[model samples]
Target chain A: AEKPKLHYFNARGRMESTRWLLAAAGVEFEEKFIKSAEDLDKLRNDGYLMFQQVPMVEIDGMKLVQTRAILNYIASKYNLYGKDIKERALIDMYIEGIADLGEMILLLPVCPPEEKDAKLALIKEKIKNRYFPAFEKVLKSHGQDYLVGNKLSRADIHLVELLYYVEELDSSLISSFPLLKALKTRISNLPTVKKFLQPGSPRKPPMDEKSLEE
Target chain B: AEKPKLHYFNARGRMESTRWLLAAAGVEFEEKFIKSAEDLDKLRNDGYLMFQQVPMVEIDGMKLVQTRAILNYIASKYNLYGKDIKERALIDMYIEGIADLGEMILLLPVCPPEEKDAKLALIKEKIKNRYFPAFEKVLKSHGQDYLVGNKLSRADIHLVELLYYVEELDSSLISSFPLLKALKTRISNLPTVKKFLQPGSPRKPPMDEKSLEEARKI
Candidate 1:
């Protein structure tokens, strides 16, 4: 197969999971950055984005968009998705659970150039009481190892990326969830993830933190 | 395997696609509907909804949450997902496209309670100028038959249901898109869908006006 090219804004918002999947699969791919209005306008005019959403991957002469769709496409071919029917469903549940948390963080109750402090307080309270507890239960129920099937899957990768972004949102969010912290460290120690995390690896970017600032 | 049990609210919001898939696949499953405040409270406290959301399913002795997760499980088993690698990705594309439009409808710009009219106006503008035209292009490019692989997949079923619900929102939503209209008609005429649509087939709850109106108030 030809090398896949990932196109997105110069941010690690939704493209992190895709990048992690490629790195884990040991695939040599190219990254295209749309860092300016002119670049975005050109892509829009070229009809590359069907819904004006980013994180599109052009591979094998086909351009795939939608974050999960692209991630699943990559994960399926690389044996990172799951092994069988039941395992796949469990993996999907974990991925969607992580996605549910990610959306909460995305819609973090801070904005309008005002009310930032009050909303941040409320968000922290919710995370402390609701979100973290739920994730802790999930990890405990699954034996605190892999999210599903007692082995690594795309769900772990997605959760690792999600943890990174969420910790950026609230640095101490996962401190109480020991299982999650360990899982994050475990995934981060993967050879490919280590390589991607190197200082000059170009993997980290300024995420969408406008709504997440303290 | 044992018969599956689908759990959701009484409203046919996100679980309609899963219900339709099961019905079309000739799978006899139990529908567990939560209608009252008491039922909802109990379900909420049951710890099954990890995200505190519904459209969960219990099959093969495993509980599953997430609408797409449940739908993909059924589709994969019933051979409605796709036949090959490329076909599955293409199907995923169509499903995600429909989901994007669904989210737009869900948000629908309705806000502030006083700006209902304005928000509805904006929604209409978006549907006319943006959403429908893009879907029409999809249908046109796919030969107006199926969304992918020249056969009926879950994407077609989802698009059919979406058109049904959208037309209810604004009856003229798909009037101008002949291909979408025809595709809707084509899928609705499938034996599985036809059977499910029968008066006593127990396919879905009426999910058109009331919720859309209620959502407008939000």
Candidate 2:
């Protein structure tokens, strides 16, 4: 069987989460690193990208675009979405909130020099007061290991990935939410995620001025 | 037999699409208009809002926040999402594109005076070139009344709502895409939506400076 083909820029951007989701799902895939304006143009011209955007993944005989759409398809196929409608709804809700927070992290590299700290500060504040409290209470409210259902669903995988982004901002951020800390540890130890964490894995590093300048 | 509870500011903001969606699904709902900061905060404090935001709805015994979450829950429950995972993905993809376009319309009012025209001009450009072309082709290629699958779905309903926003910007903005133009009329004539367009419906006029000032305080 042909593996999913990820066509994206060499750097971590919108595509990183897709990479994270796929890796955690134990799916090995290949990538096409977009190298030029013409290279991207070819994709849009060919209509391979449904929305004229990259980070497009060709999987299971379909060319998928929209990060969430691709991620959801993969999740649904692999039984990572959830077992029932209610469980899927819970996963969607949780991933959405986490995705909003992850979006703040994505904006950090693009912020104007004078404003980046303020942006990070605001993210830090929201994680503690708004976002973290929600998750901490959620985990505390249930002694269960997973965020949505009784299994390691997309929310659990995605939440751990989100924690990775925040930890890079400041490692101590995880200390404040012990349950979230435990989640990071628990999910990280999963055989698939553990493999994704290894040195040779396909995960991209956090973007920097140099990476963006490329 | 309790109606879904809508708690939001009296004006239409994010909640407007929910109204359009529920109305299209033939689901009757009641409203709890948020009048004060306290009114909004109390709901958050009481944990009725999952993310401490407005546009919260209590339905099916769940207090759902996040617009897409509420929309999807209703869509799934009402058979408006689609028939299967593949159809659902198609609906999600189409709606994501439309939602991206709708976002630009949402930003129009908040744009500064010097920049507002530029914003609308850009929106016009994208609709003509990028956004509208996709949907126009989708409708034309299939000759289906709905945007995705064989039946009316959230993508169709939401796209029609998005059209009304652009139509308000300038109704003629729609004329270029005949299929999309026809789509608005087609979806609008649906029994539920036709009633929604009539007088005394909960539909809101596009927000102006006065509505903006009123909305800002909420």
Candidate 3:
């Protein structure tokens, strides 16, 4: 298989799901981190990044955009998506749930500076009251650490990344959901994941990875 | 296959894409429209609506939530998704594009009454400057009225509905892009879709169906 080049900003945001998935699968790829206006403009003008969004990727000579779409493409190719249609549906459901959280988080950066705190408050409330409880229930009902099945699917990786972000917003957020905490630890301790989260690793931790490292 | 039951509000909001796909595929299913807060609350508490959002569906004895997930599930079953992996990825990309528009539209109903105009202005700018041109280029590159392949996929159905919403935002939206205009007419004229858009159809259009009918008259 040809090497995949992931194009995104330096931060670990939407692209991390795919980056971590590729890392866990042990697939080698180049990371082209865009930081300057010239870099961004080149991507937009050259049609390499259609939709003019970051986290664009070049895989097998095709440009793919949309974070979830890219993640799905990588997951499908790596066979980490799921085993069957039913599992895939549930995996989609879980990933979409995380995406709903992402929408809330996406709104935060665009909000008025004064309103940012209020928006975070609202997001924290919903995750506490609605999202986290539902995930905890799912974890309990399945009797497994992973969200969908006994195996480590992309859904598990997605949830781990989401919880990582949420924990950054509120340090104490995941403290109450023991199942989620255990799940985060389980995913974080994978050999490749552990190395990726290490202090001197190429893929540096923004927030939760630091806590896991400690 | 067991008949699917779609549960959502009476309005043709998020569920319309799924509704139209089923209709176009000739798949018969029960439409459960929730008209009251009590009914919605029951579904919410019963864990039927994951993510606490509407457009919940029960098919093959499994309840599914999330609009895209439900749409993918139905489209996969009915073969409206795509023929292969590349087509499916493109289909997913198109669906996500429509979803981006849908997200902007979702903010409209909840906007403060006075601030609605500003919100509409922002959305219109995005559609004109960003969304439509990208889609127009896509249509031209494919060299087909259909979005993905020679045959119609759910992406076309999604775009038709999205254009309906966009036209309601500004009636002249699709006029500049002839391929998009033709694509809209092509999908709207499908035998099942034509009936679905007809007056007095159970699945109501939020807006712009009448204008489509007028265009058909001309």
Candidate 4:
């Protein structure tokens, strides 16, 4: 009955994707938010963060750092990783692609004001041309509703999370990619995912200047 | 027998870890050194690189991109990843730690000359105070030669590779960390790893001004 404990600031940066994964898995978690710099130092002193970084997840009786590792563990534990080695490999490759784009998108909120517009444009272009088409091709080629094995894997969850972030920048970003547009809708409508998107859930609103102050 | 084809610069660069992995697994593979920028574009144009990036490996009849993904596949295929999901998680965590440090070390060759010394000092300081101690504690606490399961794993191999890279900067880097010292010796002495370290092997010499220029041409 022990729930996973999430340690991070109240904002969604690196931790949001993990939150998305956990919510998609339908797992309940309690968050111990770091409200100030001293709170973070206290965690380090307590040795809760292995890498001395936030987004640390205490699950399965271990304090796991490295966002990817924590996400992979949760995905595996939830049977969302993939059934076979080949499928897991494909999932990793796909996850890496979204993560690459996600990092670029994640920086926009915190980036310098002058650079945000140019950076956003670059991110959009990459997503449209490189990332989106690749995934669209995969969905079309596989003829599967999900990215891998026609199952709702972590890749799909991550892609939807990123789609929302991108759509925040421009609502019509994925209009041309019919497959992606469909995938996002399909994923968002899942019972757990639907609950996560609702108000008063643990999900944090998009980070603005004030949210980052903590 | 079909050997996996590696596409990257002639220099070690990102491909070195994969090379170390393949060699440790005793898998004889082929390499297509990208001689120029056009060669890279040609591969990209050919649709071989899924991510339009180097360090793409052709294995098991599929071309894999993303170095971590490729490495994970190879490690899994060769049984070096781990025996179970928990073990794999541990390996990934350790690998990620080294990767963070390795990236910092990898940039030293190409970083602006003005900031190289300062950056190197920072890297060394972090290694000593942060990274090295953590690994040392892992090994010492585990009471095993290997980082996980007391058996050789990609985590051990990767740690050794990064150890060599760090030691190149200063041979005494691990003088105080006895566990890490024993780890380097144990991993380095593996038959394949030992062979890879010798001259005339696929291993490239440390990147120098000329080597860096040669690398950029691709």
> For this target, which candidate reaches the highest lDDT against the unseen true structure?
4
Tell me the lDDT of candidate 1. Answer: 0.77
Candidate with maximal TM-score: 2
Stretches off by above 4 angstroms in model 1 are A113-126, A142-144, A207-214, B107-110, B142-144, B203-218
Model 3 clashing residue pairs (backbone): none
Alpha carbon lDDT at B63, candidate 4 = 83
Please give the range of 10 consecutive residues that has the lowest summed lDDT in model 4 chain A: A205-214
lDDT of 3: 0.80
DockQ of each: 0.54, 0.66, 0.55, 0.68
DockQ versus reference, model 1:
0.54
lDDT tens digits, residue span B42-160, model 1: 76797767666677888887778888789888899898888976788878876887887776666553355787788788777767776677678877875748887788788888888
State the lDDT of candidate 2 residue by residue for B55-133, as single tens digits.
Answer: 7888878888878778878888889988988887788888888878887888778877898888889999888888888
Error of 4 at A167 (Å): 1.0
> After superposing candidate 4, which stretches have Cα over 4 Å from the reference?
A110-118, B112-118
How would you order the candidates by lDDT, starting with the best? Answer: 4, 2, 3, 1
Candidate 2 global TM-score: 0.96
Chain B TM-score per candidate, please: 0.84, 0.95, 0.87, 0.95
lDDT of 3 at A180: 94
Q: Candidate 2: how large is its RMSD?
A: 1.5
Interface RMSD after interface superposition, model 1: 1.9
Q: What is the interface RMSD of candidate 2, in Å?
A: 1.1
Candidate 1 docking: what grade? medium
DockQ of 3: 0.55
Clashing pairs in 4: none
